[PDB]
Amino acid sequence: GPHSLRYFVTAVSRPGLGEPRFISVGYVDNTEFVRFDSDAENPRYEPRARWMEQEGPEYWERETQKAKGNEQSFRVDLRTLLGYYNQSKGGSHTIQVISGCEVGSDGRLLRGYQQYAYDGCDYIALNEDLKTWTAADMAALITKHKWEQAGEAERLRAYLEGTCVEWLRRYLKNGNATLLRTDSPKAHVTHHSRPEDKVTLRCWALGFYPADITLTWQLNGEELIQDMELVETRPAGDGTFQKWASVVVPLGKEQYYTCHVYHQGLPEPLTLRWEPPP
C-alpha cells in the first residue's frame, strides 16, 4: 500500500512567560516516530517508535541541530507575522506547518505537502503542481512574492521528490513490520431501556488498530444511517481505539436488528445482535 513521511511543526509565542514553545513531530504512515520540543530540559530529537533506535547518534545530532535551526527561524517568523498583521507584541500566536511526502506502492511520489497556518487558519500552501503557491490572505501574499523570487517552490520540489522520498524508503525499511501491524476489533452489543416503550442498542468495537473503522446497524438487511447515533473513534490509551454506534428500536423487536463491524484487521466483517444472557 501507499506510504508517507510528514512533519507536524508548531511554534507558540508565549509573550512574558518566556521564549516560544517549539514542537516538531514526524509521522510515517500517520504514526509518530520522532519528536522535538524546546520546552524540554535539553531539547533533542527523541524516537517515538522503537524501530527508530536503529539510527545512530549522528542522525539525532544532525536532526536535532536542524530542529533548533527551524526553531529560531520560527521565532523570527512569528515576529514577522506580527508585523504583517499589525498585532501587539504582548499576545500569544501560533505558527503551524505540515511538511511531507506521500508515495505510491512503487516508491515514487504521489503528492508532496508544504502548508502553513497562523493562529489556526491556512496561511500559504504549495500547489499540487509543486511550482506555485496559494496565499490565504494579504499577509501570505508577501511571503508568496518572496518565495516566488527566491524560488522556494523549486527547493521544495527538490526535497519532496528526493530527500523526502529517499528517507521515507529508509524509515519504512526498518518499520514496515511494525507499521503494518493490525489489531482486530472485538465487538458486543449492550442494552439500555429508554423512555416509553423504546430501547437502545449500542454496538461496541474495542481494542482495534489502526483507528480506521466502520460500524453499521441494519433493519432486516438495510443500513439505518439516519437515526443511528455514534461517537468519534477514540483512543483507549494503550495503543488501540474504540467506537460505538447505537440506534433506538421498539421494545420487543430487538432481534430484527443486527450490527456490522468493518475493520481491515478482520478476515471478514462482523455481524452481531442483542444477546440477552442465556
Binding site: 512533519y7 536532526e63 530542529a67 527551524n70 523570527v76 517568523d77 511538511s99 527566491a150 527547493r155
Partner: peptide, 8 residues
C-alpha cells in the same frame, strides 16, 4: 529527515 524552512 525534515527540511530546512524558509522565512515568511
Amino acid at each position: 529527515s525534515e527540511i530546512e524552512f524558509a522565512r515568511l
